[PDB]
């Protein structure tokens, strides 16, 4: 039975039942318990909001997209907002129980899979330049500042993907990748990661 | 699952929407498909969400009336809107005889495309009939339609005092939208002798 979507009096229906993304359908409506249920990736259009999703972790995020953040093991060590500025997005992170000092703080290439940080890849770089804030042949559109985290083993900061954008399918496009904390400070000149080492923390930025 | 909006966590407790008085899950995973309560998320960015039965239809931001005539084709569609001084009806109709046409809001839903089971106007005031009768009037009472040569209407009304907030005693959700084969005179009670019901549909809820 065909379900009908009207917004502000304007029909939002689907031609024939069946929502499509990204070249697969499926039923644009379920009901249940007399719950009318639609597609997480249909239901941007029906409330007027960006609705970001993060799959492995079935988190939806709706305005701002959020990342939550993991140690090796899977166990949540703090959090990030990101919004779109001009040329660039900000990041707002928290996190805790980090060993004190600087720490690289990058856009990966890649989702993490598995919750296995080697499965990030590289630096985020769709400018093709080398790594760092401080090299003249720098910069990655990933690079952020290090991480400063105190003797508490906490961090706040507001740091900027310079270039990055929350549009979608556009070169420097930040959705869908990952973030990563390493073990060892980023010296700012270094390819590929200025000598950042292990990642400790990371996680997912949704789509 | 988990749901932040513009970055706080708004998850609920034990994974259950609280909905239509039961609970349903706040997802479904249908043949590798995650699946959301559109009422979940339209109420987490605060757009009103309204569900009519009859047209299987959900209304996001304002209500949608899918009206139908005795034979259960489709002649047209209201939206309403909240007011200061009621709800704003922009109606337009297909298949109507030229000239006026009663048209009302009744008390109750049409069961199954008999227009009698819609019962009489919206009156929650205990008025008489007719916005020219000075006892009147209902607050469903709208003035006529004027249809004309080509057999569409097409309008702006008010149904004065009524509401589409919930719970109150002039509350129009739930209740129906009746088109007459005749004029209203403004004046009669009950309905200002505007004769056949011809086209009608039900007003969200
Ligand atoms: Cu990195
Ligand atoms: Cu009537
Ligand atoms: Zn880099
Ligand atoms: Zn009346």
Excluded: C
Aim: glycine share 14%.
């Amino acid at each position: 039975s065909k379900i009908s979507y009207y917004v502000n009096g304007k029909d939002h229906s689907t031609p024939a039942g069946q929502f499509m993304n990204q070249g697969t359908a499926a039923p644009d409506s379920i009901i249940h318990n007399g719950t009318t249920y639609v597609p997480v990736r249909m239901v941007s259009d029906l409330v007027g909001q960006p609705v970001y999703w993060e799959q492995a972790s079935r988190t939806i995020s709706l305005g701002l997209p959020v990342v939550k953040l993991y140690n090796a093991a899977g166990e949540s060590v703090g959090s990030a907002t990101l919004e779109q500025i001009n040329d660039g997005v900000k990041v707002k992170i928290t996190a805790s129980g980090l060993t004190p000092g600087k720490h690289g703080f990058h856009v990966h290439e890649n989702v993490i899979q598995g919750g296995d940080f080697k499965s990030a890849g590289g630096h985020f770089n769709p400018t093709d330049k080398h790594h760092g804030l401080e090299n003249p042949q720098g910069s990655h559109v990933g690079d952020m500042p290090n991480l400063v985290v105190g003797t508490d083993g906490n961090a706040e900061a507001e740091m900027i993907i310079q270039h990055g954008t929350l549009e979608k399918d556009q070169p420097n496009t930040v959705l869908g990748r990952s973030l990563i904390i390493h073990a060892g400070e980023d010296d700012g000149v270094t390819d590929p990661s200025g000598n950042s080492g292990d990642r400790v923390a990371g996680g997912n930025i949704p789509e």
